[PDB]
Each structure stands twice: as C-alpha cells, then as structure tokens.
Amino acid sequence: RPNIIYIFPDQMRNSAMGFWNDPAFASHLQGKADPVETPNLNRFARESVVFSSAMSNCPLSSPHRASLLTGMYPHRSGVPLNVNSRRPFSTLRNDATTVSDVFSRNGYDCAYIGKYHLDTPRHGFNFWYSYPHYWDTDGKRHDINQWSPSHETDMAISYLKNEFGRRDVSKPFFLMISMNPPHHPYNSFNDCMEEDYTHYKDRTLSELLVRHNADTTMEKSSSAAYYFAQITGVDREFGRLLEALDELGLSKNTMVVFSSDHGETMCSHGLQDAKNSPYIESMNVPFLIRYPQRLKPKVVDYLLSSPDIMPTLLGLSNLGQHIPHEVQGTDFSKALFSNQPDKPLPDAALYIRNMDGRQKVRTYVPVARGIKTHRYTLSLTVDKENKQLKEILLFDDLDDPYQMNNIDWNTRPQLKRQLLIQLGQLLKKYDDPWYKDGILKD
C-alpha cells in the first residue's frame, strides 16, 4: 500500500541537524549538535521516528549504497571499496536482489535520482536519473548547471506530480533520491546558494565548530560554513519535497525516510581527508522515518546499520514476508510498529575499513574492524602485509562523547571481554573476511 521516498544527501553527519539542540532530543545525540540551520528537518523530526544511533558500518559512499540496496555487508554486497576503474572487482553484484527488485516485483513503480555509480567502468527502477551530467531513462545526457540538489528535487517533484507521465499513478512508488551537493571543488564558495550561505557568513570558527574535538586552526576550518550552508540548502530542498507531498494527496500515505551515506568529521580530531574513520562524526548518520498512519513520533537508540535499511523498509511496507533470504540485515519494522515485544534487537554494529593491494587492483585487505555499542566504540587496525595488531581504539562514548580519551583496554579487562566477544559474534554472524581468514584469532 504505502509509497516510499528515501532521501539521502552525501557527507551529512547526524549531529548536523538543528533539532538536536532542543531538550526533547539533545540527550540522545553523542555530543553537541552542530549550529546548523535546518528548519524543515526540525519540523520533520517532531512528526517522525528519529534514530539517534544509526550507523554507516563502512563510512564510504559506494559501500553504503551497495549495503543500502542489497541489505548485505561490503564483503557480500560486492562493493567493499569505493567504486573505481582501478578496483574492477568492487561492483554491485548483478545477480543480487535489491530493495527496488523486491518492490518492483511487488507492484511498485521504482525511481532512482542522483549519484549511483555502483558499477565499475537498473534493478527494477522504471525511472532513472543518475548524476553537470545527468542521464534519462532513455540514456539521454542532460548538462544543467543548476545547483544539483535543486535540479534533483525538481525532477523528484515532477515525478511525484506525474508531470511527464513517467509513472503509473494507480501503483505505489519507491523513489530514491541521493542529493549530491558539489564539494568536488571545495575552496571557492561558488557551489552555494546565497539563500543558504547567508546564515553562516559573519560567523566565527568558534561559533561554527562547537564540538570539543574540533581543531579550529586548520585550513579546512574555513570550509565549515560552506559545509553547513549546503546542508541548509539540502534541508530547504527537502522542505520543498515535503510541501509537494502535501499539495498532492500523498503526505498521509507516504513513508518518508531521510538519511545519509556517511558523516563528515569536519576538523574533528584535526582530521584532514575526513572520511572512512570510526569516529562518531564519521559513522553516525541521520535517520528519520515519517509514516503518518503506522508510526508514532518518538526517538529510538537502535543501532541501525546500512544492511538493516532494506529489510526494515520492506517490513515497514507490509512486505516483510518477501525479504530475500541471504539478506543479512535486521528488520526493525516489528520493533518500530509495536511496543518493544522482541528480544534479538542488535546490541552492537560493525565498523568496516578495507583498502587495495595493487597490480589493476583485484583484491581488498580487511585492515580494520570494530563495533559500536550503545555505550562504547572499539576499532582495531592491523598491518596490511601481516595481519597483526597495529592500533586499538576504545572510547566510552557516554563519558567521552567527543572521543578524546582513548582508553587502554588492559586497564579494563572486564570490558575487554565483553567487547571482544561482541565483535567476534558480529564478525561471524555476517561471515566477515576477518573470519574467513581468521584474522586476529587472538
């Protein structure tokens, strides 16, 4: 029955949403909220289920998208590394059953808009508009200089109104929108609309970077206003979509999910090249579900993972009996619908980091694995050539939200037992390469 709109911008961390500053929400976000302007997401959060601890296990664009569409982790999804010609083996498995595959096979219209690029140089999607370079359902190339989130919202809205007859309105739809603001140039503020930047000019770095781990002396620190301004612009475009949903008869019977592929530390821990790291600024992503008829507005601390989105989506659409059987994710629909009447709710989520070994790269090395629980963060890194322990990251995220006190785990052996058992259980339950190769049998 229900329509589904899944909107996810790039590089938006969970802390960068204004309503995390309010008393009814702040106690659930790890650390201080970002001083960002997101009025539409603010109103949206009060009518939706807000996930405080949704995680991107592999905090990279391509691995998350593969895990989002397949409900499986980067070793089973086929994308453990960022999709690139120089890693031909990293690609969405053609013989995989995606979330759109199930929906389209169950009488849905399926539309994808934005950055895809999960194939090295469709899956039931009737409507295709990939991302200065866009491609139609026909293969038509469209070069438009309009700010990319604006153009993708326009195409999303026209699809919703059926302005051009690209969908059968007598069917439900599953519309995926990946909003792609342009950080590829960074430096110059050109890729920003005045309407959104105007909130962050005349703001000091101390006013912009409010998280205690933020290095306010970097060259990247001048980009903070740029980063927040595009988030504001994406929220503004998200509000346009919500108003469009209201002007049609769609708001009451549409499940609207807002998320992101990964976060952005943004000078947290003084991090240049701020991507693919176990820090909460890089792993915690937004996750909000507005299901007006079937979901009551609340805040949940579920450890949601990328492979968990597809089964949960299918479950929330009364399609829980059609989830493919090698889908490793967890269906949170029964927990979201009812009043906590289930036991096997995940206690921790995986963190995955891999890299290449060249000569043109055909294999990847599982150099880092870890778990994020309700209270703790653990991440273990090993040598590339000899899988021996190289680094240990342990943070008490309740007392150290900004992850500034790397606890030595030998000082707390009781916690070391708990977390190492949990990491092993997670690594085997999903059959991680750290299990195939038995990495760190220690």
Author numbering: 31 to 151, 179 to 188, 197 to 424, 429 to 511
From the paper:
Through genomic comparisons with B. thetaiotaomicron, a new PUL-like operon (Bfo2285-Bfo2295, and Bfo3043) was identified in T. forsythia and the crystal structure of two proteins from this PUL-like operon, Bfo2290 and Bfo2294, were reported using X-ray crystallography. Here we define a pathway for the degradation of CSA by T. forsythia based on the discovery of a PUL-like gene cluster found using bioinformatics analysis, functionally characterize three proteins (Bfo2285, Bfo2290, Bfo2291, and Bfo2294) from this PUL-like gene cluster and report the crystal structure of an exo-N-acetylgalactosamine (Bfo2290) and for a 2-keto-3-deoxy-6-phosphogluconate (KDPG) and 2-keto-4-hydroxyglutarate (KHP) to D-glyceraldehyde-3-phosphate aldolase (Bfo2294).
The structure was solved to a resolution of 2.85 Å in the space group of P212121 and iteratively built and refined to a corresponding Rwork of 0.230 and an Rfree of 0.276. The smaller second domain (C-terminal domain) contained a beta sheet consisting of 4 anti-parallel beta strands (β10-β13) and a long alpha helical region (α16) running orthogonal to the β strands but in the same plane as a solvent exposed structure. The superimposed structures had a final alignment root mean squared deviation (RMSD) of 1.105 Å, structural distance measure (SDM) of 11.021 with a cutoff of 10, and a Q-score of 0.797. When Bfo2290 and BT3349 were superimposed, it was found that many of the residues found in the binding pocket were positively charged residues or polar nitrogen containing residues with a positive dipole facing the substrate modeled in the BT3349 co-crystal structure.
